[PDB]
């Protein structure tokens, strides 16, 4: 109904979005956010794709968000040799796009408040369920028909649910860390091709850069905390970059590279899985609180946004019965949120075994070959996760099946070539 | 050295054992047990080489071994009534049945045998730090207390580990498997053991499994494993009987025809939880052992055994490195995590395998096969159960050797098979 009351823990990306969806069902939605309001007072800028945009569209916020973001119509792949090689993102209609964490969070919090039946309570944190006010130890919690945990990867709500029975949970800090470095404008234009995801794929080290609107790119650098150990000196940084990423040094400030590198230390990436996502129609997790995935497919925000949407579809489908919706969310969504978590991890692993200048290209071009050969039966993985709402686990199934039929189908051509050689050679 | 204070959280199997080991190198050791003294106020488990070696280290092997029943073989109850006994590898090598309780009581008492040790019953813990907050006999008496070492031996649901979990770079995972477990008892018949008293008795259905271990009165205690699902489908005495008739037909005579009823409805199926984490320490002030560090699913009889080996390996390190906890805590994590993850894995593998590929028969084949090849090549092939039960081959190496073996067999006999045919 309308006059049930729901509290959203977290005024983040997902928290805000959810509060919009819920406000839009005429719920009374109170959003509690630890930090002070970011419009007055982790990733700097992220990749927004079909799934997230479809969630944004259900609240009539897609157009606003899309207008502040720069399109990425292709990958641009920076070889060690200096060779820049550019592969488009699937079809001509499909592109991912680069937006800013904060512009996104800000517009969303504003959208939250635009619903008169919704408040957002900045400077409120949470200890048990016990929300704090402005002054700490002002424990003035207050009850609700739904508590929605959108408190992110280090989730308080999840922490309570983890103590409950038959709750599987896991948390892995991976070997690599990330740190942000910014490419500026060169004479007031973009120093690189600005409608491209820029990748510098080495194996143990990888860099990406995503265009902003002030004509800059922000780059994240990934490498094992091991190598972060090995560059304590400005000379080392320089030497490293000269070795592994030659064309960055000119692109980035040669000297600002050193201010920005040592500005604060490499960030850890956590992976948390859990099951199930809910508790007896009084409590549910969503986004990074439910799944926190290593940032290796551009899908963490997209998936958490999609949680919000999938929920909202179940609230339509089951006329707002939380006792139905909460177990159904967990049944329907956990497979997918786990599968994207796996995809993300697979990718990260793959990217340290073998992706160099060269492999990236072969892998994608081969993918493009086979789609062009046999559409629809082969759709590349990237297309499936980035440009559709095919369920993630299904996309994994299809992606395995496809790889099975490419391997089996290659074998017979290899062997028919192998008999064809000998028969034409003898006679 | 003598000046150092240590607290052991939990006065369980591992906690009490560790407290001995520590007391025995002159620490000031205080054990804090949330329960009341079980000596005044898994019922029974499978002791083996690893545990016995740790027990030996502290002068308590003999005391414990006196009160247990040797199980010199497996005894396999097939659905038809057939009962095949496969021996444990060697006449010297047997596993033995003991009580959780008697074991826990003798260790508590041995802890108290040392003048520099105290155990503090009815004391629970709230919060700790690298200053801890233990509860008194009266709830809400939160007195602080300090120490040079805090050893988390507080079990599968470990308070101390909950604190480590919050710290950075700390990997942790919990998984409750589908099956729970229930204890049942085969009494004595006419004052004697109702079955061969020196076997581990196994009834391997797939979705349902059951084992039985002798006690010293002339009974066996059984554990029944099945999916919590099936447990839900047996609410009445009739259903339990009707089930037992289907899956474990020889039991209804063996077990009290209605002792079964008393015991099955005595209290609900208990869940089995796998927990894994890394690392096992926090920078020389704090260390996890036994189930706090590794709760494994109970399908290799190794849980207590590994936890006891933890205590032994810590002692070995404290010897090697002259009691430097700055060195031993990281070295413990470094040396022991691979092994303690390995046995966790072995345990779970075993448990999945026992839901698909062991009916009555595969158990015999697999074991007999394995026995054949040991006899053929006593050094290059040692069977799995022998390596875990009867040696201190490190768990991870045992899994290596084991995989290697499986490969040389698969390759070598696929060579005989495919080439000569
Ligand atoms: C390096 C990196 C790159 C990434 N790149 C991409 C990308 O390209 N594309 C993409 O889709 N995703 C990306 N992601 C994923 C994305 O950052 C997250 O998935 C997304 O922020 C999840 O939103 P959320 O609201 O669940 O968590 P958050 O956005 O972190 O929000 C959590 C909010 O809850 C608040 N909070 C925490 N605790 C409490 C409490 N006790 N009480 C009240 N409030 C609390 C916090 O203050 C915060 O505002 C990336 C992540 C990283 C780390
Ligand atoms: C069905 C089953 C069969 C098993 N069979 C075998 C087998 O055949 N062989 C084998 O080797 N192992 C077996 N195990 C494993 C064995 O039971 C455990 O390995 C062993 O009990 C772990 O010892 P521990 O001292 O770490 O944990 P526990 O023995 O559980 O000790 C934890 C202790 O700490 C106390 N405590 C907990 N929290 C606090 C707190 N906050 N403050 C103070 N005190 C606290 C608890 O009261 C308890 O006494 C089996 C387990 C199960 C469930
Ligand atoms: C932020 C964002 C948005 N999309 N992607 C992304 C991720 C992975 C991809 O596959 C890599 C691969 C191709 C072929 C073989 C193995 C791996 C592709 C792709 O297909 O272009 C695109 C990222 C991203 C994030 C971090 C790193 Cl390190 C990175 F390279 C890219
Ligand atoms: C308490 C205790 C002590 N040892 N074991 C044990 C465990 C596993 C074993 O391997 C099984 C297997 C044999 C052959 C092939 C696959 C698997 C063997 C063995 O080889 O005898 C013995 C148990 C135990 C615990 C739970 C169950 Cl369910 C169980 F059956 C026995
Ligand atoms: Cl991500
Ligand atoms: Cl066990």
Numbering used by the authors:
A (entry chain A): 6 to 46, 52 to 139, 146 to 443
B (entry chain B): 6 to 46, 53 to 141, 144 to 434
What did the paper state?
KMO is a class A flavoprotein monooxygenase, which catalyses the hydroxylation of L-kynurenine to 3-hydroxykynurenine (3-HK). We determined the full-length structure of Rat-KMO in its membrane-embedded form complexed with compound 3 and compound 4 at 3.0 Å resolution. Unexpectedly, the crystal structure showed that the C-terminal region was comprising only one transmembrane domain, with the other predicted transmembrane helix lying laterally along the membrane. The KMO monomers are linked by intermolecular β-sheets at F183-Y189 (β12), strongly suggesting physiological dimerisation.
Furthermore, introduction of a benzyloxy group at the 2-position of benzoic acid led to a dramatic increase in KMO potency, especially in the rat homolog (compound 3). Optimisation of 1 produced a potent inhibitory compound, 3, for which the crystal structure was determined. The ligand-binding pocket of the full-length Rat-KMO was composed not only of residues from the FAD-binding domain but also of residues from the C-terminal region. Surprisingly, R380, a residue from this C-terminal region, formed hydrogen bonds with the carboxylic acid moiety of compound 3. Compound 3 was recognised by hydrogen bonds on one side by residues R85, Y99, R380 and Y398. On the other side, the chlorofluorophenyl group and benzyloxy group formed hydrophobic interactions with surrounding residues I215, M222, I224, F312, V371, M367, and F376. The hydrophobic interactions may explain the remarkably low koff values in surface plasmon resonance experiments. No strong contacts between FAD and compound 3 were observed. This sequence discrepancy likely underlies the difference in potency between these species, as shown in Table 1.
